[PDB]
Amino acid sequence: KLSEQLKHCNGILKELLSKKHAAYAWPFYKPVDASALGLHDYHDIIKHPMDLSTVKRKMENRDYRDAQEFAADVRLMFSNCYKYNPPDHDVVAMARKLQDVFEFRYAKMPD
């Protein structure tokens, strides 16, 4: 079950990183460089940064023991975006679209 469910998670992760979703996935590829972007309040508002490169490293290192732990990091990434940004910002529209991809495929988890 656990290996099988984590392979489903790895499949989802590969899809989120694939060219298919690149138009709206790209802000989530790497850690937010707050200083580079002039977001000098980012790390005061976001206590637990998360991004797909960190999720990929954790998957590669067999850090995730189950699908629930993987999903918590993916949703933390989206939640950080919804917490920090005005809700009408382009990056929030991009987060909503990538979260739709994630949630619909995560829901197809093998039992």
Ligand X SMILES: CNC(=O)c1cc(C(=O)NC2CC2)n(Cc2ccccc2)n1
Residues found near ligand X in the complex (CB under 6 A): 27-28, 32, 37, 39, 81, 84-86, 89-91
In whole angstroms, the minimum distance from the beta carbon of 11 to ligand X comes to 23
* Angle value at C-alpha 29, between 70 and 77, nearest 5 degrees: 45
Residue sitting closest to ligand X (CB): 91
In whole angstroms, the minimum distance from the beta carbon of 46 to ligand X comes to 8
Which CB, 15 or 27, lies closer to ligand X?
A: 27
* DSSP H helical ranges for 1-111: 2-16, 22-25, 34-37, 42-45, 52-60, 67-84, 90-106
